[PDB]
Design a protein around this ligand. Structure first.
Ligand SMILES: COc1cc2c(cc1Nc1ncc(C(N)=O)c(Nc3c(F)cccc3C(F)(F)F)n1)CN(C)CC2
Ligand SMILES: COc1cc2c(cc1Nc1ncc(C(N)=O)c(Nc3c(F)cccc3C(F)(F)F)n1)CN(C)CC2
Lengths: 291, 293
C-alpha cells in the first residue's frame, strides 16, 4: 500500500501526457497538462512489479506530501494504475542547472549566490522537518520559466529512509554488539549537515562546470575522501571570485560535521544575504539559451 | 552470477554419508557427515538455491571460508551444487559450540575462558589482517572439536554485510558531491574491526555467567541504553570469583570508544591470555566434564 491518499485511477483522466523529460534516480518523468485548468505538471512514473517492496516509494511520497515550501517542488497527488505509480509534481520549464550550464557555460558569482540562497532556504526547511536531501547537485536543482529555483528528486532520500527502517526492523539480537554498531543501526552515522557540504560542491560545479575530482574514478574518490588528513577542495581561479565566495566555499566545506554550519547559519552568510539577489539573475542566464 | 568458481557439480551423497542434523546457524542447516573414502567426519551446510535467487551472500561466505587458512577458523573442503541445493563442506567440530557445552557443564573456569579468549584473538588477528570482520562473535559461534581446539564459525552475518557492501559500491552513482562523513559510511559502515573485540569481551562474560550482560532486559531497551551518552560498559557480576587480570581484560575489551579499544594483536599481549598454562588440556577437562557430570 504505497500511500493512503493514492488515486486508484488512470492519470490520463486528468492529464494529457506531452513528452518524456528523462529520469532521475529512478522512474521516468513526463511533462503533462491538466485537462481542466491547462496548468503544466511533471508526472513521475515508476513500474510496480508483483514482488516489489513499496517502502522507497512510500517514503518519497511522504517526503513530498508533507513539504510546503516554495523552494521544494510542489506535490499534487499520486496515481496507481496498471502496475504504474505516477507521482504528480510541479513542472520546472527550464530543467536543471546542469542542463542549463552545459549550454550557457559557467554561472556568474551573483547567479551562484542567488542559487545558493534559494537552495539554503529549501534545505533549512527540509532540515527543520528532520529531512535530509542527500543528493544536492546541479542536476537536482530545477529552474522554472520565471527564474525560480526548486529542489527535486528525493529518490536518494527515500531509499536511505527505507534502508534505515529495514536496518531497524532486522537489527537482530543486540547483547554482543559494540555500541558503535548499535549507534549506526539506530542513527545512520551522519546528519543533515551532509547537504551543506554538497551545496558547497555544487557552488564549485556551477562556477567550473564540474565538481572537484570529476575525472577521478568514483570508488577512488570515496577512498581519497576518507584517506589521511583529506583537504577540502577549493575554487580553481583565485582572482575570478570574491573573498566572500571563497569564504562561503571554505565554511560549507568544513571537513568535520561537528564544526560545519547549519543551513540557517549559512543564510546569514555575506554571499547569500547580500542585496540584489533575485530571479532576474536567472532570467539573464535563460536569455543566454536563445542568444 | 557464478556461485563459486570451484563448485562441484555433483551429488555430495555420492561422496558423503549424512549422519545427523546438527541444527542451523544464521541461515541454512548443517549435517554431520562421513567421507565414504577416507572415513573423515565433516560438516555439510545445506542451503536452498533456486535458479533465480540472489547468490551474493553464499558467494561471499564461500569466499571467506575458502581464503582463510588459519587453525582457529573452521576449515573449508569445497562446495556442491545439486538439485537446487548448495552444500558447503567444512571441518566438523565434535563438541559443538561453547553455548551447547556451558548449558550442560555450567560456567567455564577462568583458565578455560582465558584459553578460549586467546584462541579467538588469534582467529580475529588473522581475520583483521585480511580486512575481514566476523561481526557475530558469541558462544554459539565458537566451536570446540574433540581435541579441545577452538574454531570460529558461522560467517553468515559477515557474508551478508560483505554482499551489502559490494552492492552499495556497485550502485554508488556519482559520489563527487558526497560529504566525507557520508563517504566514510559508504566504504566502512561507520564502524571497524574493533567491534569484534567488544564482542569477545561480552562472550567472556557469557562463558563466565551463562548469559551475556543485560540478557533479561528487552533488546530494544538495551539498544536504547547503549546509544545514550554515559552508557556504562558491563562488568562481571561476582567481583571475588575472578582475578584482577580477568577484570582488566573485560575493562579493556569493553572500551566504549572504538578509537581507544585495543586491537586483537595488542590484546594477545594481555596478561590474561599471555599466561604460560593455557593449552587445549583445559578444554579436554571441560569435555570430560561434559561426558559424565
Ligand atoms: C522542460 O523541463 C525539464 C527538462 C529537462 C529536465 C527536467 C525538466 N523539468 C522538470 N520539472 C519538474 C520535475 C520534478 N518535479 O521532478 C522534473 N524532474 C526530473 C525530470 F523530469 C527528468 C529528469 C530528472 C528530474 C529530477 F527529478 F531529477 F529533477 N523535471 C531534466 N533534464 C535531464 C533534461 C531536460
Ligand atoms: C556435534 O557437533 C555439533 C553439535 C551441535 C552444534 C554444532 C556441532 N558441530 C559443528 N561443527 C562444525 C560446524 C561448521 N563447520 O560450521 C558447525 N556449524 C553449525 C551447526 F552445525 C549448527 C548450528 C550452528 C553452526 C555454526 F556455524 F554456528 F557453528 N557445527 C550446534 N548446536 C546448536 C547443537 C549441537
Amino acid at each position: 500500500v504505497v500511500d493512503p491518499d493514492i488515486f486508484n485511477r488512470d492519470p490520463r483522466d486528468h492529464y494529457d501526457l506531452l513528452q518524456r523529460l528523462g529520469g532521475g534516480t529512478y522512474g521516468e518523468v513526463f511533462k503533462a497538462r491538466d485537462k481542466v485548468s491547462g496548468d503544466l505538471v511533471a508526472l513521475k512514473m515508476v513500474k510496480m512489479e508483483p514482488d516489489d517492496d513499496v517502502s522507497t516509494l512510500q517514503k518519497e511520497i511522504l517526503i513530498l506530501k508533507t513539504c510546503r515550501h516554495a523552494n521544494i517542488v510542489a506535490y499534487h497527488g499520486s496515481y496507481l494504475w496498471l502496475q504504474k505509480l505516477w507521482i504528480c509534481m510541479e513542472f520546472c520549464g527550464a530543467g536543471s542547472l546542469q542542463d542549463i550550464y552545459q549550454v550557457t557555460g559557467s554561472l556568474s558569482e551573483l547567479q551562484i549566490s542567488y542559487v545558493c540562497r534559494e537552495v539554503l532556504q529549501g534545505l533549512a526547511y527540509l532540515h527543520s522537518q528532520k529531512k535530509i536531501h542527500r543528493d544536492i547537485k546541479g542536476a537536482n536543482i530545477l529552474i522554472n520559466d520565471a527564474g525560480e529555483v526548486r529542489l527535486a528528486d528525493f529518490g536518494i532520500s527515500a531509499q536511505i529512509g527505507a534502508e534505515l527502517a529495514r536496518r531497524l526492523e532486522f537489527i537482530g539480537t543486540p547483547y554482543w554488539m559494540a555500541p558503535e554498531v548499535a549507534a549506526v543501526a539506530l542513527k545512520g552515522g551522519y546528519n543533515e549537515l551532509c547537504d551543506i557540504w554538497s551545496l558547497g560542491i555544487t557552488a564549485i560545479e556551477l562556477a567550473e562546470l564540474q565538481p572537484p575530482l570529476f575525472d577521478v574514478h568514483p570508488l577512488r574518490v570515496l577512498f581519497l575522501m576518507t584517506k589521511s588528513g583529506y583537504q577540502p577542495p577549493r575554487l580553481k581561479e583565485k582572482g575570478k571570485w570574491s573573498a566572500a565566495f571563497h569564504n562561503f566555499i571554505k565554511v560549507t566545506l568544513t571537513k568535520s560535521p561537528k564544526k560545519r554550519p547549519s543551513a540557517t547559519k549559512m543564510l546569514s552568510h555575506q554571499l547569500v544575504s547580500q542585496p540584489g539577489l533575485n530571479r532576474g539573475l536567472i532570467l539573464d542566464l535563460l536569455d543566454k539559451l536563445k542568444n
